[PDB]
Design a binder for this molecule. Structure first.
Ligand SMILES: Nc1nc2c(ncn2[C@@H]2O[C@H](COP(=O)(O)OP(=O)(O)OP(O)(O)=S)[C@@H](O)[C@H]2O)c(=O)[nH]1
Lengths: 293, 305
């Protein structure tokens, strides 16, 4: 109800791994759920709730369909549900749309997070990665798509893989912190629900800066992020969060908010807020989520 | 800032990883892979992956390396997803069983495909464990050698020529855990907690890339002439199998407290140079470890025979 109930579901090996990284990094205010979808292997998790329903998406779908009642029990009462298969493919890409449709049929605000692999990784048959996206799209309120190729314009191979993991985690945290963790400017969850319900595909931009003019700088970087693929101009829904320390000033906060308004489409809904994270020092971190056209 | 991951595969490797964690090895991520779910519940590793669940039903590979290989191969995408982002990957196991023997080369190949500096650290079984385990270890080692930049092989038989003569079997395997820790830590601490002489990731990569098959020696000592003593012990270690003189590549680590001075470091280094092959490439590095007290610990990795 008033403290929103947010459930983050990692499904398949990539999804469970994503959730374990969220746990290791101290992501707060959410319940973690790890769903293993493979018969032959189990990735363990320190998630609160675990379900072992076990490289084919079709296998993952059936496994989740078969466990639909149990998954529904786990999700019941959630105001918001994140679903991700994380990096890599496999059975998780088949199971994710099932978890999403259960969440949504229950009335929860349902947010998918999906990555497009780097082009250098090649491609498995049937266009199955794109098929995974479309299935998840049909099944979510908002699907946040992270095109990993765009990271190479923001690099060694190890750096590329690490960037991919970082932005994936932020695909959840940027939004959840805005809701769960107080800052000077707080948001109404109903407006989040208002802007994200039925919104469809979304893209994300991030930006970071320190010291002098940091909030404007980080915001300008986020808004121009290659991960947004220049979707900012035409976006009809924009969520923006600025994370920083307690000393984050209202004037500098408002400058960033003004910038995003000036860059967004005239008719865009804009949800804006701040997050206090005193671990950041004199750094601020902006997350922008753009949806619609 | 190098990302280092240490994989323990099979019961022996997972037990060694547990030992590494218990002894406070820092700056590395610990990954445990096994075909036994209950055994993995006891692991303190950061990442725990249970493999070959259909084929083994959580009971191990029954000493059949083919089962271990297929279990790891079946989980190769998952394993790759766990390793992605690593600059360096260690793969440790006791060779001779099914899971480690069969699975370790799969993990190493994935690491090497990703371009991570890939170092295997494995034991040969004790002769008393039987000829099938020795033969299986021998095949597992050749296989793992194809997949690693450097493969450090520790003959468990030589461990019985070290430490105490009244050891039990459990104490013997515990010494195996320790030596595996020593081989990993001897290398990783250069990078993660350097002393006065800094050997960084690029230096380690320079000497360990494609170095091939390797042997290790360890020594420690306290008090007067500790550094000379520790170095002579390591140089003469049974684990080095009297092959120090033939090695074209040597990486040496000397660990001590913050007050370990250059004179001492250099005495040990001089001793090792003198004992080395004339054309040897030797890299000398130091480690800060403020828990060591008055002791210093010298590790030698010999390759290129
Ligand atoms: N370092 C260490 N080595 C061990 C330990 N127990 C056994 N070993 C060594 O490792 C070898 C392989 O044993 P183990 O690792 O337990 O098999 P496995 O790889 O898990 O293979 P399995 O599934 O067929 S049971 C043994 O032959 C022995 O030499 C241990 O606790 N610590």
């Amino acid at each position: 109800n008033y403290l929103a109930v947010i459930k983050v579901v990692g499904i398949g090996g990539g999804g469970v791994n994503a959730v374990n990284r969220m746990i290791e990094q101290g992501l707060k205010g959410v319940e973690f759920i790890a769903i293993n979808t493979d018969a032959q292997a189990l990735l363990m998790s320190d998630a609160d709730v675990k379900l072992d329903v076990g490289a084919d998406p079709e296998v993952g779908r059936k496994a989740a369909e078969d466990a639909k009642d149990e998954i529904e029990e786990l999700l019941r009462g959630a105001d918001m549900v994140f679903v991700t298969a994380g990096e890599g493919g496999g059975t998780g890409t088949g199971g994710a749309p099932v978890v999403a449709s259960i969440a949504r049929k229950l009335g929860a605000l349902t947010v998918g997070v999906v990555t497009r692999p780097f082009s250098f990784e090649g491609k498995r048959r049937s266009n199955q990665a794109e098929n995974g996206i479309a299935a998840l799209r049909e099944s979510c309120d908002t699907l946040i798509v992270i095109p990993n190729d765009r990271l190479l314009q923001m690099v060694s191979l190890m750096d590329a893989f690490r960037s991919a993991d970082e932005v994936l985690l932020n695909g959840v945290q940027g939004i959840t912190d805005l809701i769960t963790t107080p800052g000077l400017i707080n948001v109404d969850f109903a407006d989040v629900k208002g802007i994200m319900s039925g919104a469809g595909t979304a893209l994300m931009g991030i930006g970071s800066a320190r010291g002098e003019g940091r909030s404007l700088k980080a915001a300008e970087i986020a808004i121009n992020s290659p991960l947004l693929e220049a979707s900012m101009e035409g976006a009809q829904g924009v969520l923006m969060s600025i994370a920083g320390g307690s000393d984050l000033g209202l004037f500098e906060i408002n400058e960033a908010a003004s910038l995003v308004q000036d860059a967004a489409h005239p008719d865009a809904n804009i949800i804006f807020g701040t997050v206090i994270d005193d671990s950041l020092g004199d750094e601020v971190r902006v997350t922008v989520i753009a949806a619609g056209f």
